[PDB]
Amino acid sequence: PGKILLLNGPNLNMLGKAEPDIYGHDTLEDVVALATAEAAKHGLEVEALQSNHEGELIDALHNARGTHIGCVINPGGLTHTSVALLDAVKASELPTVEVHISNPHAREEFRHHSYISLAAVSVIAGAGIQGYRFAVDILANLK
Amino acid sequence: GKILLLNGPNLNMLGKAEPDIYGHDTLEDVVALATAEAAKHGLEVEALQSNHEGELIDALHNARGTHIGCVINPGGLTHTSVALLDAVKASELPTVEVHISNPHAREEFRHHSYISLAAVSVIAGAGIQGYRFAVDILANLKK
Amino acid sequence: GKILLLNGPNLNMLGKAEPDIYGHDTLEDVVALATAEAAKHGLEVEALQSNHEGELIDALHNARGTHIGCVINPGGLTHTSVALLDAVKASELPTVEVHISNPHAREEFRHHSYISLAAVSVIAGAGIQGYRFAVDILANLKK
Amino acid sequence: PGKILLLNGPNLNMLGKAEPDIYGHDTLEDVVALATAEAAKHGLEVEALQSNHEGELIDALHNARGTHIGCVINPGGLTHTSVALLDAVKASELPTVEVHISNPHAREEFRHHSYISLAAVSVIAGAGIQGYRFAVDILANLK
Amino acid sequence: PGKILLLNGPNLNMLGKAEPDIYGHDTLEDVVALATAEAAKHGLEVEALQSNHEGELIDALHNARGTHIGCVINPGGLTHTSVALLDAVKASELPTVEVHISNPHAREEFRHHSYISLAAVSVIAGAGIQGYRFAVDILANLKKL
Amino acid sequence: PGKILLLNGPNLNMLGKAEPDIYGHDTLEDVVALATAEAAKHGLEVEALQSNHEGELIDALHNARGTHIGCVINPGGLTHTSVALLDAVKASELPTVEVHISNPHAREEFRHHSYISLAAVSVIAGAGIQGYRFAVDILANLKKL
Amino acid sequence: PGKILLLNGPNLNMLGKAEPDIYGHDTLEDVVALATAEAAKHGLEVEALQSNHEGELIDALHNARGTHIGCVINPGGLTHTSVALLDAVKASELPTVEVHISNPHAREEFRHHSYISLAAVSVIAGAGIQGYRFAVDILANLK
Amino acid sequence: GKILLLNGPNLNMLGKAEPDIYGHDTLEDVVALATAEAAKHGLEVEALQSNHEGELIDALHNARGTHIGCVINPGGLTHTSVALLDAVKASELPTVEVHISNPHAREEFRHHSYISLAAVSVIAGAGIQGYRFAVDILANL
Amino acid sequence: PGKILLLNGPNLNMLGKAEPDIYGHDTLEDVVALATAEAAKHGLEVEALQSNHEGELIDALHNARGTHIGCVINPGGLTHTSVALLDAVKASELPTVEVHISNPHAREEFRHHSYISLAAVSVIAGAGIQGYRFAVDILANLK
Amino acid sequence: GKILLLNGPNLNMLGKAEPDIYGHDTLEDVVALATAEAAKHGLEVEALQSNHEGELIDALHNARGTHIGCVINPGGLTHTSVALLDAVKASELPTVEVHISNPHAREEFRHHSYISLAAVSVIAGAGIQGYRFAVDILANLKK
Amino acid sequence: GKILLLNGPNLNMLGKAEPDIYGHDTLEDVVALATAEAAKHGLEVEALQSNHEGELIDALHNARGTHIGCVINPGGLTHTSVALLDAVKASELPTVEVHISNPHAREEFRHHSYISLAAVSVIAGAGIQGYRFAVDILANL
Amino acid sequence: GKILLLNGPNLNMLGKAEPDIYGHDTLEDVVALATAEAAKHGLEVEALQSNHEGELIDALHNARGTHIGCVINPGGLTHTSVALLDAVKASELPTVEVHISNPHAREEFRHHSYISLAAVSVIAGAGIQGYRFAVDILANLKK
Ligand SMILES: O=C1C[C@@](O)(C(=O)O)C[C@@H](O)[C@@H]1O
Ligand SMILES: O=C1C[C@@](O)(C(=O)O)C[C@@H](O)[C@@H]1O
Ligand SMILES: O=C1C[C@@](O)(C(=O)O)C[C@@H](O)[C@@H]1O
Ligand SMILES: O=C1C[C@@](O)(C(=O)O)C[C@@H](O)[C@@H]1O
Ligand SMILES: O=C1C[C@@](O)(C(=O)O)C[C@@H](O)[C@@H]1O
Ligand SMILES: O=C1C[C@@](O)(C(=O)O)C[C@@H](O)[C@@H]1O
Ligand SMILES: O=C1C[C@@](O)(C(=O)O)C[C@@H](O)[C@@H]1O
Ligand SMILES: O=C1C[C@@](O)(C(=O)O)C[C@@H](O)[C@@H]1O
Ligand SMILES: O=C1C[C@@](O)(C(=O)O)C[C@@H](O)[C@@H]1O
Ligand SMILES: O=C1C[C@@](O)(C(=O)O)C[C@@H](O)[C@@H]1O
Ligand SMILES: O=C1C[C@@](O)(C(=O)O)C[C@@H](O)[C@@H]1O
Ligand SMILES: O=C1C[C@@](O)(C(=O)O)C[C@@H](O)[C@@H]1O
């Protein structure tokens, strides 16, 4: 039945190898498994996608319009730079939860700005991969 | 195992104050939800709400070494109080910052949080469910 | 018909503190002038001054639904307190901001007011007569 | 025989027709009548002028030097843009009360700044046309 | 049917003589003729005014309230400076198209801010005097819809 | 004679479905049809491309260098963010008209900045899809002169 | 023969009466006399105009195009606010010297900005009325 | 001859809080040091620490006309309270500002002090010895 | 057998044709040949890639992790806008030399900022295509 | 009566350095012109040019009480040196600041002058004639 | 045991320059005060004042490894010289920054110090007594 | 054919000062490396290091018209000296800016260079090898 769009942006494929002091030793496979297990608890399915390509994420949002209950998004660095990604989230009309493994507000000033936070129903930061589980919980209860 | 639940100024008005922004749940609903989630991990909650910054700072000092972590919604003090950030550091409690609303979608002066500099995680816009996720983070860090 | 009159920190020192800026009138004079003006309109005033922000916040909360409006001189909190603006909003009282001095003629840090965002009216530099006009605004809104 | 200069800047001739949700349904004729009635209570006269030309207000201020007890001015949009009008108020040496029908601090950021507030003895905003009655009362008592 | 208010602000009277490398060699009379001819294609008339005096522009906006279908405005330097002129456009209640002969966003930073852009339904910049023809076309079609 | 490059950036494929209170109920196909019909009035043709992929827009600009008389571009959100897209317009050497359906200067502050505006000969904003028709008219007349 | 356009903007008519601590006790008549005497030394004439009206100054610049050797301008407060005045100076094509009786850079921050300095051949500030004499000297030698 | 010694929020935690920044000395140590320096000049010290800004403001109001001066470590209120500045001005007390750490070597939000606008002197980074220097300044004024 | 990743970002395929007054008449093929010849002098190989797609450079950086001695990157306009590319360089763990044909600091202000300079071991600007020869020399000696 | 003429760094290159900006006159031409003008008022000039800030500061200290004023073109030190402003204040010389070019028409970093805070007058863009006007100001202040 | 005492540009004019701000004490007074405080702790003071930044930099370079610390009043260089900061770092000397006035109560351009980033301690507004406190800080380090 | 090699303040301390940032090479090593590289191209180097800005300025002036170019590491003057940029411009030498460290990776005050506005090339973070590349740029421009 209900489907959640799980979108991971640039560099998320490198989770577990990239800056482990900041992002931890968990993998993207762990993220998808955790979100899928949480959704299954609520009778929902997860359609997951990761890409270093902003255009692929936008295409995914457009394609999910009208057919998914919501979106869990970790835009990566696009969080602080893409108005196009924000416009895509708005075009999707999907209730969207923004997730960050790290706490961007405890990092460089350029990470303190998120175009997505303008459209997101909720923002979860610094909870590690557990943020994805909470994000699924939010969407399952909005629905 | 004990979690300190701290709600700052105006949170006693939850359910009455600006319901289009903060919703129709109450501070009692917040405390009962954090309590129910803490019980799933075999923990208890010590809850305090105050309109007085000094009472929150005294509560953080008093919890040092005796609590496993702090769930804090500093309210307006989020954006203004260095003294509260120094109190969180002095407590040495792992701290999750919660906001009912999404401050990044509101006025520019709400985009700045002193507490986000020290918090292990920040949850915004999830309504009262944010407090449930914050207990989950603290129970799993301690674990 | 009751007007909440709130004076913030340091206003107890009116007549002694910086008399070249604030003049020689006292807080007693302020309360008496506001009381006499309210009486002309069949109204009473409940007055409170405090060096504690939490006491002002508690007063706004306690006056919700029972008072016709608030006259507030926030003192130095004018420039610093988001929590006090949130309390004015939680109170749902039509609020007149009063400053004895003209803050726009003083240091740059006094040019910004959180309360001015939510106030129905702002009166500055009329001395203690500003409290008389503030009562007249609230009595006529009530009419 | 004591005389007050009442100045209304650009667009105030449209009072009652322009943006009634912001400025109300009263007219410029109502404003002048209200100021005149208040002045008469104190044995004072009001010389009123409105113009869509900044130069006309400056001329009026110069011509009033030494012959008027004070000035009540609503500069309109000139409030946020004219250093020339500020210099004129100072050249006049007239005690000046700045009046705004609306509360500019509750509006767009460009309206939060006033050159005239730097020289005004008092600033009244958001009291509707009653602000002009309070302004006359201030001048009659300074005198 | 109906009348469009065409307003040109300070210095536009100097069109063809002032900084021709930036503003071109056409005159203000060419602008008015072009706007009038475009309006005529839609059975509309144009009341044109230019002034170095901001108050005259404000008076023209006040006087046009309720009797014109819209306003085409090139505020000149007042674009970047006048809150009073924005308040006058709001008081007019006229649907307004802002026109610039040059492309202000390709010029000095102080030209990158427009008060009028906050109220205008459309902004046309850098089309030379042809921007006034497009502005009449927008107002003719808003009115028709 | 000649061909105009019409480029639409990210999200424009969603025209008619995305935020219709801001962008209207016309489709991207209506935009292309309108531009093509205007071009035909001048004996010109239009090569139209839309993509959510910035690289595709850059490739289209590179490929159009020397063979097209000009470019009409609605960069979408890339307007506010992409230096790479400005560098591509410069590399194209095409006279460029920037078009926005909405009036970005009446929206959020982050929409008030355009890299493309630094290179465009003209900028048209808030005319709905009619801005693309005016943009073809500008390019048809620059080419004629 | 050669003619210099001397333009004095808003408030300059008040020279000698306005803020004498800042602007001195000399009059506008003194300014015109001094400039006229200096020009006469070089076989030149001065066409002087003062107005509180920006439109009058712009009209004067347009009218002087092609018939004057240059312009001496004290724009008053328009110095820090008018792009229209700058555009007019450029349209005039007149070599222009900007003159300030006071030193604006030793005053409020808003006086530190001049649109005219962008077009002026020279800027003279703080020399009192003597600045006008120097300005005539510059234009007589450019010519 | 009496000096008002005011310590702001969190200073009660001196010795336990962020010892790599504030050291291992305690508030008791600060009060003893200031009291001994004051006694060398025949002066006494009325000391108060509070996490409650209103209490510090009341203390300043009550010391008006009775004290030779004030030594103040406002804590985080240093960067946030106009009210505390207004209180210092209302006190009319010559005031020395003291910081155990050097705020200018820390986060930008700590580079701003409202009290520094009114203080006769500002001492930073000298640890608890700053309080001894501050007493010396008020004694020689 | 030691391998250097040579990355050229958007528009660099147009080298020799685009803005020749700024970037010169040399081509991308010249750049790759120059880097390759320099690498061969040190017994090293160069794997070169250019793309108008940010995602392709990110993919290339990820794929090169652990298998290359370093990276020479000219990000093009991505230099001033992509946090994702910076995160990618860090994920790669490759010593990276940033190269600009032009001197961006001598150009528009928006070109004065580089995200890549935050992670690069070295930055070479304005040496034309010789910058790529110097970059290879840096990597060959760090190695 | 003696005037101190101080020229800062690079002014020895006048006539060679950036002639499109500074013209074709020399530092010798500057000194001879100031000398000729000082002689019309019965004064002498002591001229020093140095590329060393310390030598200018020593010259200001040494002129204290013995000179009637200072004509200074600080060169690049205009925009950067607080030490030079403190030296001008320590000298107690009435000081006229001269610039050959118009800094307000150049790069933003040239729009700031520490010396303009202390100077009685500032002359910019008049070429070497500025020095002549500066001597005239000093001769008439002393008079 | 030797302390390097460095005074920057204009400090030679102490007593004559802006006496309403800097007081009537002289540079000779500052050096004597610091020297006497140093002698109380069995230490000596090598003092230098200069209007030439290069001389101050050379002094810091030459004191590397030979001095217990540095007391510095950089004058206007405080708000302008990265070179002087680089010199302090090159010296490796524990450094106390001293200001006779309180720069935070003055013009905004005086609110910024490059030296405050490297200094162990900053003392402002105590007049020439700041130098005595600075010697005390280095002696107890 | 002669290259002016200028090293600014503190560079005499290379190898002792902050070795974790600048490394263990000495100023002698810098001069010897630059000298050997120049010799390969039939060129010589005239080297100067000073803790005095005026000495560097004098050197640039003295090298005008006789040297083929300048290699400059301005030290802390990079971030602070307008007078040094004006000297580079007065010299008319094609100039390469060299930094041993990568200033973009360090404190914000080190991110700004006056010399970078005028330099033909900027090389940062290559250690002392940056001086070798700088000589190679100047020799090939000369070719
Ligand atoms: O790519 C990432 C990861 C991130 O989104 C996170 O999950 O923490 C935070 C971003 O700032 C960063 O660019
Ligand atoms: O008091 C509150 C409530 C809040 O903390 C929240 O929960 O959303 C957000 C704050 O900005 C505000 O001042
Ligand atoms: O405490 C006060 C009094 C005040 O609010 C007034 O009444 O003028 C002005 C405030 O700036 C100041 O901090
Ligand atoms: O013209 C007006 C009217 C106004 O002064 C008022 O009365 O509220 C407020 C101004 O911001 C505006 O430009
Ligand atoms: O006066 C004008 C003309 C203008 O409005 C235009 O038409 O291009 C642009 C304005 O910036 C300038 O001040
Ligand atoms: O994508 C779009 C559409 C737009 O370019 C327009 O056509 O109005 C305006 C942009 O700000 C926005 O990001
Ligand atoms: O009106 C004046 C006079 C003035 O131009 C002068 O002559 O000093 C300076 C201006 O700042 C001021 O607004
Ligand atoms: O509370 C404190 C302690 C402090 O005042 C000090 O003593 O160093 C410094 C402040 O920045 C901080 O908030
Ligand atoms: O694409 C490029 C080329 C460039 O990186 C260079 O090589 O100089 C400089 C960048 O600013 C520009 O966007
Ligand atoms: O050195 C100079 C010359 C100068 O002072 C002038 O005379 O125009 C202007 C300064 O900005 C520049 O640094
Ligand atoms: O030269 C000095 C003296 C000073 O350092 C002091 O001692 O107070 C303060 C500095 O701001 C000023 O430039
Ligand atoms: O003195 C130096 C050395 C330096 O120029 C370098 O070589 O890296 C970098 C500068 O920031 C610093 O002040």
Q: State the DSSP string of K62-124.
A: HHTTT-SEEEEE-GGGGGT-HHHHHHHHHHT--EEEEESS-GGGS-GGGG--SGGGT-SEEEE
Report phi then psi at G78, rounded to 5.
Answer: -60, -25
Q: Which residue of D has its CA nearest to C127?
A: D122
Q: Which residues contact H100 (CB under 8 A, 6 or more apart)?
A: H14, H22, H23, H73, H125, H126, H127, H128, H130
Q: Do chains A and C touch (3 or more CB pairs under 8 A)?
A: no
Distance CA K63, CA H25 (A): 32
Which of B95, B102, B132, B143 to mutate to test binding with chain A, by most A CBs within 10 Å of its CB?
A: B102
Show me where the domains of chain L are located: 2-123+135-142
- Superfamily for the C2-103+124-134 domain: Dehydroquinase, class II (3.40.50.9100)
Please, what is the Cα angle at B27 between B23 and B28, to 5 degrees?
Answer: 120
Reduce the secondary structure of chain E to three states and give it as a string.
CCEEEEEECCCHHHCCCCCHHHHCCCCHHHHHHHHHHHHHHCCCEEEEEECCCHHHHHHHHHHHCCCCCEEEEECHHHHHCCHHHHHHHHHHCCCEEEEECCCHHHCCHHHHCCCHHHCCCEEEECCCCHHHHHHHHHHHHHHHC
- Superfamily for the E3-113+124-144 domain: Dehydroquinase, class II (3.40.50.9100)
The H or E element that residue H22 is part of is helix H19-22
Nearest CA to E122 among E73, E82, E69? E73
Whose Cα sits closest to atom 2 in ligand 12?
A: L75
Residue G15 CA to ligand 7 center (angstroms) comes to 10
- Note whether F142 contacts E: Cβ–Cβ < 8 A: no
End-to-end CA distance of chain F: 13
Distance CA J34, CA J28 (A): 10
Residues of chain F with C-beta less than 8 angstroms from the C-beta of A59? 52
Nearest CA to L11 among L24, L27, L23, L22? L27
Distance CA F103, CA F112 (A): 9
Structural fold of domain G3-74+84-142:
Rossmann fold (3.40.50)
Nearest CA to D82 among E79, G8, G78, G114? G78
Query: What separation in angstroms does the CA of K46 have from each of I115, K4, K49, K68, K137?
Result: 46, 5, 11, 11, 17
Per-residue burial over G52-79, b if 16 or more Cβ lie within 10 Å, else e, is bbbbbbbbbbbebbeebbbbbbbbbbbb
The H or E element that residue A123 is part of is strand A122-125
How buried is C53 (Cβ within 10 angstroms: 0-12 exposed, 13-18 middle, 19+ buried)? buried
Distance CA H75, CA D113 (A): 33
Question: Could you identify the residue written with the tokens 């999830």?
Answer: B126
Method by which the model was determined = X-ray
Reduce the secondary structure of chain I to three states and give it as a string.
CEEEEEEECCCHHHCCCCCHHHHCCCCHHHHHHHHHHHHHHCCEEEEEEECCCHHHHHHHHHHHCCCCCEEEEECHHHHHCCHHHHHHHHHHCCCEEEEECCCHHHCCHHHCCCCHHHCCCEEEECCCCHHHHHHHHHHHHHC
Helical packing angle, F28-41 and F130-144, nearest 10°: 30
The answer to whether residues L50 and L8 touch, using CB atoms and an 8 Å cutoff, is yes
Which of D34, D121, D139 to mutate to test binding with chain C, by most C CBs within 10 Å of its CB?
A: D121
Q: Nearest C-alpha of chain H: how many angstroms from B81?
A: 7
The answer to whether residues E75 and E82 touch, using CB atoms and an 8 Å cutoff, is yes
CATH class of F3-144: alpha beta
Nearest CA to K36 among K5, K80, K10? K5
The H or E element that residue F71 is part of is strand F70-74
Distance CA I142, CA L134 (A): 19
C-beta atoms surrounding L107 within 10 Å: 12
Structure tokens at F81: 């963010």
E74 Cβ closer than 6 Å to some ligand 5 atom: yes
Select from 2.40.50.70, 3.90.870.40, 3.30.565.10, 3.40.50.9100 the CATH code of J2-142: 3.40.50.9100
Sheet holding E122-125, edge to edge: E45-50, E3-8, E70-74, E96-100, E122-125, F122-125, F96-100, F70-74, F3-8, F45-50
In this structure, the strands spanning A3-8 and I44-50 are unpaired
Helix (H, G, I), strand (E, B) or coil at D49: strand
**What CATH number does the domain located at H2-68+81-110+119-140 have?**
3.40.50.9100
Distance CA E26, CA E22 (A): 12
Instruction: Show the DSSP H helices in chain F as ranges.
Output: 20-23, 28-41, 54-64, 83-92, 130-144
Distance CA I139, CA I35 (A): 11
Residue L82 CA to ligand 9 center (angstroms) comes to 26
The HSE-up count of residue G44 (CA atoms within 13 Å, CB side) is 28
In this structure, the strands spanning B121-124 and B95-99 are parallel
Question: Could you identify the residue written with the tokens 């006469």?
Answer: G40
Concatenate the DSSP letters of all residues of A56-103 into one string: HHHHHHHHHTTT-SEEEEE-GGGGGT-HHHHHHHHHHT--EEEEESS-
Whose Cα sits closest to atom 1 in ligand 8?
A: H75
Helix (H, G, I), strand (E, B) or coil at L118: coil
A122 annotated to a ligand binding site? no
CB contact under 8 A, G58 and E18: no
Beta bridge partners of C47: C5
Q: Nearest C-alpha of chain I: how many angstroms from F21?
A: 30
Query: What separation in angstroms does the CA of J117 have from each of G107, J79, J89, J139?
Result: 8, 12, 10, 21
Distance CA J143, CA E84 (A): 48
Helical packing angle, G130-142 and J129-142, nearest 10°: 160
Distance CA I99, CA I135 (A): 7
Structure tokens at L47: 């080297």
CATH class of L2-123+135-142: alpha beta
Per-residue burial over G88-119, b if 16 or more Cβ lie within 10 Å, else e, is bbbbbebbbbbbbbbbbbbeeeebbebbbbbb
For chain A, give the number of residues.
143
Report phi then psi at H93, rounded to 5.
Answer: -80, 130
In this structure, the strands spanning H44-49 and H2-7 are parallel
Per-residue burial over A44-83, b if 16 or more Cβ lie within 10 Å, else e, is bebebbbbbbbbbbbbbbbebbeebbbbbbbbbbbbbbbb
The HSE-up count of residue D22 (CA atoms within 13 Å, CB side) is 18
How buried is D66 (Cβ within 10 angstroms: 0-12 exposed, 13-18 middle, 19+ buried)? exposed
The answer to whether residues D104 and D125 touch, using CB atoms and an 8 Å cutoff, is yes
Q: Which residues contact D46 (CB under 8 A, 6 or more apart)?
A: D3, D4, D6, D32, D35, D36, D39, D136
Which atom of ligand 5 has the smallest separation from the CA of E22? 8
H106 annotated to a ligand binding site? no
Q: Which residues contact A110 (CB under 8 A, 6 or more apart)?
A: A80, I83, I115
E77 Cβ closer than 6 Å to some ligand 5 atom: yes
Residues of chain B with C-beta less than 8 angstroms from the C-beta of C82? 76-80, 109-110
Q: Do chains A and F touch (3 or more CB pairs under 8 A)?
A: yes
Helix (H, G, I), strand (E, B) or coil at K47: strand
Question: Hey, which of I61, I83, I118 would you mutate to test ligand 1's pocket, going by the most ligand atoms within 8 Å of its Cβ?
Answer: I83
L69 Cβ closer than 6 Å to some ligand 12 atom: no
For chain H, give the number of residues.
141
The answer to whether residues D78 and D53 touch, using CB atoms and an 8 Å cutoff, is no
Distance CA F128, CA F134 (A): 11
Distance CA D41, CA G12 (A): 37
Please, what is the Cα angle at D115 between D113 and D116, to 5 degrees?
Answer: 115
- Note whether I82 contacts A: Cβ–Cβ < 8 A: yes
The answer to whether residues D38 and E83 touch, using CB atoms and an 8 Å cutoff, is no
Concatenate the DSSP letters of all residues of B72-85 into one string: EE-GGGGGT-HHHH
Distance CA D141, CA E20 (A): 58
Whose Cα sits closest to atom 6 in ligand 11?
A: K99
Distance CA I101, CA I18 (A): 12
For chain F, give the number of residues.
145
Nearest CA to E7 among E55, E38, E47? E47
D117 Cβ closer than 6 Å to some ligand 4 atom: no
In this structure, the strands spanning J121-124 and J69-73 are unpaired
Structural fold of domain A3-142:
Rossmann fold (3.40.50)
Question: Could you identify the residue written with the tokens 């508030």?
Answer: H27
Helix (H, G, I), strand (E, B) or coil at B64: coil
The answer to whether residues D34 and D132 touch, using CB atoms and an 8 Å cutoff, is yes
Query: What separation in angstroms does the CA of C73 have from each of C14, C79, C84, C142, G111?
Result: 12, 11, 11, 20, 32
Query: What separation in angstroms does the CA of D28 have from each of D14, D23, D50?
Result: 8, 11, 9
Structure tokens at A4: 């959640």
CB contact under 8 A, C121 and D103: yes
The answer to whether residues K120 and H124 touch, using CB atoms and an 8 Å cutoff, is no
Helix (H, G, I), strand (E, B) or coil at A45: strand
Q: Does domain B7-120+134-142 have CATH number 3.40.50.9100?
A: yes
What are the start-end ranges of the E strands in D9-142?
44-50, 70-74, 96-100, 122-125
End-to-end CA distance of chain H: 12
CA dihedral of residues A13, A14, A15, A16 (deg, nearest 10): 140
What's the DSSP call for residue K10? T
Distance CA F136, CA G4 (A): 48
C-beta atoms surrounding I47 within 10 Å: 16
Distance CA I14, CA A66 (A): 41
Structure tokens at F30: 């209506």
Chain centre distance of CA D83: 16
C-beta atoms surrounding B104 within 10 Å: 22
Question: Could you identify the residue written with the tokens 């040297």?
Answer: L67
Chain centre distance of CA H32: 14
Q: Does domain K2-71+83-140 have CATH number 3.40.50.9100?
A: yes
Residue I12 CA to ligand 9 center (angstroms) comes to 8
Helix (H, G, I), strand (E, B) or coil at L30: helix
Residue F82 CA to ligand 6 center (angstroms) comes to 13
Query: What separation in angstroms does the CA of A58 have from each of A86, F27, F99, I9, L111?
Result: 9, 18, 21, 21, 35
Distance CA K138, CA K43 (A): 10
Concatenate the DSSP letters of all residues of L58-116 into one string: HHHHHHTTT-SEEEEE-GGGGGT-HHHHHHHHHHT--EEEEESS-GGGS-GGGG--SGG
Q: Does domain I1-70+92-102+121-130 have CATH number 3.40.50.11540?
A: no
Distance CA F50, CA F8 (A): 4
- Amino acid present at K11: L
State whether the Cα torsion E23-E28-E34-E35 is positive or negative: positive
Residue E57 CA to ligand 7 center (angstroms) comes to 27
B10: left (phi over 0), alpha (psi -120 to 50) or beta: left
- Amino acid present at H132: R
Reduce the secondary structure of chain J to three states and give it as a string.
CEEEEEECCCHHHCCCCCHHHHCCCCHHHHHHHHHHHHHCCCCEEEEEECCCHHHHHHHHHHHCCCCCEEEEECHHHHHCCHHHHHHHHHHCCCEEEEECCCHHHCCHHHHCCCHHHCCCEEEECCCCHHHHHHHHHHHHHHC
Helix (H, G, I), strand (E, B) or coil at L117: helix
To one decimal place, what's the resolution in Å?
A: 2.0
Distance CA E19, CA E1 (A): 37
In this structure, the strands spanning L69-73 and L95-99 are parallel
The answer to whether residues C97 and C72 touch, using CB atoms and an 8 Å cutoff, is yes
Residues of chain K with C-beta less than 8 angstroms from the C-beta of H121? 102, 123-126
Structure tokens at H43: 């002066």
Query: What separation in angstroms does the CA of F127 have from each of E102, E121, I72?
Result: 18, 7, 46
Which atom of ligand 11 has the smallest separation from the CA of K102? 8
- Superfamily for the D2-73+84-107+124-142 domain: Dehydroquinase, class II (3.40.50.9100)
Which of E117, E136, E139 to mutate to test binding with chain F, by most F CBs within 10 Å of its CB?
A: E117
Whose Cα sits closest to atom 1 in ligand 5?
A: E76
SS3 content of chain A, % helix, strand, coil (to 5): 50, 20, 35
CA dihedral of residues B27, B29, B35, B39 (deg, nearest 10): -170
Structure tokens at D61: 């201020």
Distance CA E64, CA G83 (A): 26
Nearest CA to C125 among C140, C110, C103, C106? C103
Distance CA E71, CA H31 (A): 74
The residue from F23, F42, F68, F115 that is catalytic is: F23
Per-residue burial over A15-40, b if 16 or more Cβ lie within 10 Å, else e, is bbbbeeeebbebbbebbbebbbebbe
Distance CA H49, CA H57 (A): 12
